[PDB]
Design a protein around this ligand. Structure first.
Ligand SMILES: CC(=O)N1C(=O)N[C@@H]2[C@H](CCCCC(=O)O)SC[C@@H]21
Ligand SMILES: CC(=O)N1C(=O)N[C@@H]2[C@H](CCCCC(=O)O)SC[C@@H]21
Ligand SMILES: CC(=O)N1C(=O)N[C@@H]2[C@H](CCCCC(=O)O)SC[C@@H]21
Ligand SMILES: CC(=O)N1C(=O)N[C@@H]2[C@H](CCCCC(=O)O)SC[C@@H]21
Ligand SMILES: *[C@@H]1O[C@H](CO)[C@@H](O)[C@H](O)[C@H]1NC(C)=O
Ligand SMILES: *[C@@H]1O[C@H](CO)[C@@H](O)[C@H](O)[C@H]1NC(C)=O
Ligand SMILES: *[C@@H]1O[C@H](CO)[C@@H](O)[C@H](O)[C@H]1NC(C)=O
Ligand SMILES: *[C@@H]1O[C@H](CO)[C@@H](O)[C@H](O)[C@H]1NC(C)=O
Lengths: 121, 123, 123, 121
């Protein structure tokens, strides 16, 4: 019963939309971030992911990848959709932001990590 | 320099294998993952993964991310990294991952996420 | 702008409390942490912590890190973050942590590290 | 019997020393990194940490903080000391590098994560 489909916003002011989830748990979406680590102008970017359907849990885990359209980086988020007594949903996620580096010797510094909480609308 | 491509069969440094299919013009790909190690005693099942490669500036060593939707637990893992040509000329994926466990209630969310690394090379 | 200082009693967003003592001229400090939550079935006990604040350029919002040496589990947590003055003028510590569980075999080292955030405010 | 005391090197060519561990599990050390995220010249920097002494485990966990002397950042490492059949030790660790940001709205991008394996030098 906690569904990922909808329009969500996070603590930083970014918004995301997620469409219908198919029977395979696959979904697509859009992400408009309010903040960036680049100096490039932000552009709405696509996202793709899946919800885990094992045991058809009411509060499933999920993951998705945001394919940034204004930088060479990629972010992944994973988390769980929690739904209260009243039907109010929260997604509690963690993410990794992968920057592009030119030299393999600099790989060690390429991955930032953090949390995000999404609520609806 | 060679272009590093994600399509192919890979193995990681713990002996898990994944196969990634063709990457489409939107940077999307599908594959399967067969893990050698596990955080559950349930029998391991090949599981699908889906992700994208970043094609901005058409870099020869692109970043990417994907989600593995495990078929034998309620967890999900995400990986992100970059496809490099290594110093010896081989393709290698340098990745980090978050493994999200399912918790029964929200007050246990703090303990639900593991993190680590993996390096993949082509099989 | 106030200088954000780590000395004091703090509480987090899960009800855990910590107390940090004076910071010496080398940036070192000691404290105690009383966690509201645990991943063990042991009785929680107050545990020591030790860490440092970075004093380079004597920033008024310095970074810092510390290790909590749990006295009721075989695990270790490390925290690192920055002491900020918030938009409302209050001190706030914004931190990230890694909780390292003990495993028995080196093959299981990949599942030993959980990650998360904590924000602390002064009590 | 796996002991943190010694000189170690990691997989990127950084070295560290750790001195005697006291009965409270406390130790001090030094760290000379081979790599940096700053453009400042590298300087050997002190570290302080603890090993967990509960049940006096033969392969203890531990954590420590490196207080960089050439940047405003801090890195913390945590991991476990493993020791094999003939006494060969390896420290398997993960780390968080906290950079300094000027404004609290940029906190989200301040923390990088990675692994490090140390062996005896
Ligand atoms: C709220 C939150 O944590 N995030 C959010 O909504 N936007 C930022 C990042 C934006 C990356 C854009 C591409 C780039 O700068 O390379 S993904 C994690 C973080
Ligand atoms: C090599 C490596 O680090 N990993 C790998 O290849 N398999 C494991 C995890 C498998 C999770 C299976 C689902 C579950 O147990 O819930 S994903 C990160 C780790
Ligand atoms: C609030 C927050 O995120 N944390 C907090 O205040 N307590 C928990 C963990 C406590 C570990 C106790 C020892 C053990 O169970 O192994 S450290 C991160 C987390
Ligand atoms: C091997 C490994 O991963 N690390 C290592 O030995 N040095 C780098 C970083 C050095 C930070 C220096 C201070 C700064 O640049 O601000 S700590 C993690 C990483
Ligand atoms: C989020 O949606 C709200 C209004 O619905 C808008 O005010 C805000 O600018 C959006 N955020 C971004 C980053 O577009
Ligand atoms: C990885 O593929 C190799 C070579 O085919 C195979 O022998 C091995 O069993 C595979 N690993 C897993 C976990 O299936
Ligand atoms: C935090 O300190 C407050 C105020 O003294 C107290 O009510 C609460 O029990 C403490 N939390 C824990 C985990 O001890
Ligand atoms: C590490 O110690 C080795 C052996 O002395 C030395 O070759 C190397 O330069 C040291 N690394 C650094 C970053 O000092």
């Amino acid at each position: 019963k906690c569904s990922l489909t909808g329009k969500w916003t996070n603590d930083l002011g970014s918004n995301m939309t997620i469409g219908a989830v198919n029977s395979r748990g696959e979904f697509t979406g859009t992400y408009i971030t309010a903040v960036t680590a680049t100096s490039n102008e932000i552009k709405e970017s696509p996202l793709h992911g899946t919800q885990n359907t094992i045991n058809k849990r009411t509060q499933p885990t999920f993951g998705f990848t945001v394919n940034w359209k204004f930088s060479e980086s990629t972010t992944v988020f994973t988390g769980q959709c929690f739904i209260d007594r009243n039907g109010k949903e929260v997604l509690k996620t963690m993410w990794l932001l992968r920057s592009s580096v030119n030299d393999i010797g600099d790989d060690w510094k390429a991955t930032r990590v953090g949390i995000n909480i999404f609520t609806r609308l």
